[PDB]
Amino acid sequence: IHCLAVRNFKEAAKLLVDSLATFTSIELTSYESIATYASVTGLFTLERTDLKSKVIDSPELLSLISTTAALQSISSLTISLYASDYASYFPYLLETYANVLIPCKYLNRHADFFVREMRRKVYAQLLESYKTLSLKSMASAFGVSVAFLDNDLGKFIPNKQLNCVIDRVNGIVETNRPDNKNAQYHLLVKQGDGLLTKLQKYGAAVR
Amino acid sequence: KAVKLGDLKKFTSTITKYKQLLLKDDTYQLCVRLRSNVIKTGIRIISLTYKKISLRDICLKLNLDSEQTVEYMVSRAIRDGVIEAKINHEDGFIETTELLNIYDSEDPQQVFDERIKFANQLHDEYLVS
């Protein structure tokens, strides 16, 4: 819960997301609540391979499918991601956002930005599979607009979240290799101002 | 919301109402660089950072200025070193060079010169105190 504001989410995948007790702890949280945060956060941290090896592997999910279907994220976000279908994944964003993220007691503060990130990640992973793809070929059947699709992707460039090939006026769309000798050297640049912070700080009176 | 996102429309509405706050010491003169980043950072929010771009796609976001003067926007940032691009006069083909070969020879050496002098920086202070 404390990592939900920092948005680390990695240390909570094997602790908060992975629950040893099938039924909740009462005074801490709720049975439907502890099973809801496992699916929401698990899709952001655990990859698609770990979805079938962990989420459905745990017996806690099998008991939720045959009892409470009100979450709607078990038959929507899980199937659309496993099948890599963006056409069906788009309309389930708001339906889940309304019945999960809005009633959510933690992540309801910052929501729309958290959804827009995972919205492209489903399509970003599919981009690695195909080499050459036009703009209007399969995107017209996905039920989305071309203008709004480029607006969200255009703002992700300064965040260093796009190494790939995305084009609009022409429409030739390819994939790239984020592992190279550029980001390999980026580790040293990021540590430039963070390593010398405390070295020149306490070295005034002492040393 | 304006300078960092490179938006000219929301920048003019910010300077107009807050102009009273610009009457402080040297708070007006910093606006010269605030409106220049609208062009500089505006290139980054536009897809010009991507390789294959056409002018007809550029005129959409820059429509607030004009058509034929867009060639002056990209070319000005090329000499300064912000981004390199090639402009076509017919359809406005924009091919921007993306360098994946950097940080190989003499490029990291500028940073290596600093990492070498950090060892004896705090080490020589031990002999002093």
Partner: peptide
Amino acid sequence: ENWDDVEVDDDFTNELKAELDRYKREN
């Protein structure tokens, strides 16, 4: 948290329902 976290345009709700209605009317 940078500006992207505190931005919250609240435009995700209207843009999702609009695109679904546009595709159904193109039939």
